[PDB]
Design an enzyme around this catalytic site. Structure first.
Site, PDB file in Angstrom:
ATOM      1  N   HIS A   1      -3.240   0.086  -3.716  1.00  0.00           N
ATOM      2  CA  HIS A   1      -4.097   0.594  -2.645  1.00  0.00           C
ATOM      3  C   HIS A   1      -4.361  -0.492  -1.599  1.00  0.00           C
ATOM      4  CE1 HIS A   1      -4.693   4.039  -5.314  1.00  0.00           C
ATOM      5  NE2 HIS A   1      -4.742   3.126  -6.265  1.00  0.00           N
TER       6      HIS A   1
ATOM      7  N   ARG B   1       0.837  -1.206   0.000  1.00  0.00           N
ATOM      8  CA  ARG B   1       0.000   0.000   0.000  1.00  0.00           C
ATOM      9  C   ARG B   1       0.873   1.256   0.000  1.00  0.00           C
ATOM     10  NH1 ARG B   1      -3.639   2.987   4.837  1.00  0.00           N
ATOM     11  NH2 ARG B   1      -4.889   4.243   3.383  1.00  0.00           N
ATOM     12  N   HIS B   2       0.425   2.268  -0.746  1.00  0.00           N
ATOM     13  CA  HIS B   2       1.077   3.558  -0.828  1.00  0.00           C
ATOM     14  C   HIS B   2       1.348   4.119   0.588  1.00  0.00           C
ATOM     15  CE1 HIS B   2      -2.685   5.499   0.349  1.00  0.00           C
ATOM     16  NE2 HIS B   2      -3.269   4.592  -0.417  1.00  0.00           N
TER      17      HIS B   2
HETATM   18 NA    NA Z   1      -6.585   6.369   2.599  1.00  0.00          NA
HETATM   19  W   LIG Z   2      -5.651   4.248  -0.363  1.00  0.00           W
END
Ligand code: NA
Ligand SMILES: [W+6]
Ligand SMILES: [Mg+2]
Ligand SMILES: [Mg+2]
Ligand SMILES: [Mg+2]
Ligand SMILES: [Mg+2]
Ligand SMILES: [Mg+2]
Ligand SMILES: [Mg+2]
Ligand code: NA
Ligand SMILES: [W+6]
Lengths: 266, 265
Positions: free
Chosen positions: B194, B8-9
């Site tokens: 994500h 995830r970023h």
């Molecule tokens: Na978020």
């Molecule tokens: W996100």
């Protein structure tokens, strides 16, 4: 130009995040350091008594190093002239100072003056913490450009485990006295890298203010974030200090929670 | 053993400063300033102007630190990173770049932008007002993107509003391609995406059907920045195993808003 004193709280410590057992978490069955979470730093500096004296002298977490570096980088960007750096003998404080100076690009030019007179109030520290500090040579071997010739206003062995609030605020006043008298002709910024308590105890004497009530003071030391800053400037012609906005902005960021996906989904 | 690491970023500016963050850092006539150190030192230039950052925000300073810490840990782990795919969201391409920088692989490995691993466009806070940086803009802003990579899904094809069932099919489709893009040569492929991707990009690899939408959402909301999911391939037995990631987790605390005037006097 106006001479300045910037008081800075140290970055995030490992024990703020990992709690009382942090040292047992990062010690292997064979007694070596390792990182069981990425917020543990890459290494611990060499010390007297091995890894075991870090007990009451925790280092910065990886996040605390980031905070310190981010603040030094902002200071570089600001254009301000930094002329001296004083640090609490606590590892977390010397490390914050080191990382700020590295990003100022001044780590070689300015030596960190270690000043036990701006160490935490002994009330809130282990009694054997006076005996816990890295020596200046240990720090030097660990790559901290420490001023070996600096003569502290309060030597480390003069810290009294039972000092009262009144005694605490007095020795901060005296330390700031000497710090201000090093060279009163310098016109840049001096950094004081210390504890939450210092943003009050190191500035009120400069401002000519009476000590805060102990209870009010205790409530205030809870409110200062990692790398929290307080800036005093001296008026040249009357010698009076005033609080002004620090030369750099605050740092606001979120937490990152512990996580294991395989655990989560069971 | 061939591995796939879903990541995830890092922390986004708008997670910390809210949806009005852009108002907080731009002057009357669109000039960028830094009102808090967690705002980045600069914004890259955008085709349709800064307004487009509202639906495609950058990493905060803390997000950049998180990305770099994970890259540095991956390097220390000794694993060999073969390839890097990233969602077109700016925050993902930024996270990929900073990971690659600390792996010291940013000149050597080109980031492959994959619109197929973009977020779920139901949760997504917009309608038809989301515009990514083009590969050309990204390369302009010094992301070593793969100009020659042919994506599983074109960014124009991204069905602008989707349900859960549509999202999961798409992710499964794209992961099929990504598993076929890579040459047989193992090492580890990074999938920078994500929080929803840690499930939707792994369940299809594991030959598993999608979760009930409530169960998915419940698990997905608790993935931190730089949270990871790791799947290894059993080549002889032709199937994938969910395994322990090659790097440790990252736990740190917050830093609260401070106003010196409120306290120091
Ligand atoms: Na978020
Ligand atoms: W996100
Ligand atoms: Mg000079
Ligand atoms: Mg000594
Ligand atoms: Mg007392
Ligand atoms: Mg857990
Ligand atoms: Mg909001
Ligand atoms: Mg406040
Ligand atoms: Na603390
Ligand atoms: W403290």
């Amino acid at each position: 130009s106006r001479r300045g004193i910037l008081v800075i709280r140290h970055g995030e410590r490992v024990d703020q995040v990992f709690g009382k057992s942090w040292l047992q978490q990062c010690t292997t069955a064979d007694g070596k350091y390792y990182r069981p979470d990425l917020n543990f730093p890459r290494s611990l500096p060499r010390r007297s008594n091995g890894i075991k004296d870090f007990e009451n002298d925790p280092p910065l977490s990886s996040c605390g190093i980031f905070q310190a570096r981010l603040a030094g980088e902002a200071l570089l960007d600001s254009g301000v002239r930094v002329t001296a750096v004083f640090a609490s003998p606590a590892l977390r404080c010397v490390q914050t100072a080191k990382h700020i100076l590295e990003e100022l690009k001044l780590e070689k030019k300015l030596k960190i003056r270690v000043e036990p007179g701006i160490f935490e109030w002994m009330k809130w520290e282990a009694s054997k913490a006076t005996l816990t500090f890295l020596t200046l040579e240990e720090l030097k071997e660990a790559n901290f450009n420490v001023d070996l010739d600096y003569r502290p206003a309060l030597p480390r062995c003069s810290l009294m485990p039972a000092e009262s609030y009144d005694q605490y605020v007095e020795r901060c006043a005296v330390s700031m006295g000497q710090i201000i008298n090093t060279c009163p002709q310098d016109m840049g910024i001096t950094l004081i890298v210390s504890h939450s308590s210092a943003l009050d105890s190191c500035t009120r004497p400069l401002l000519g203010l009476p000590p805060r009530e102990c209870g009010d003071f205790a409530q205030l030391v809870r409110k200062i974030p990692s790398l929290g800053m307080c800036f005093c400037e001296e008026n040249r012609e009357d010698g009076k200090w005033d609080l002004v906005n620090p030369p750099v902005k605050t740092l606001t960021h979120g937490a990152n929670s512990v996580f294991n996906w395989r655990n989560w989904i069971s």
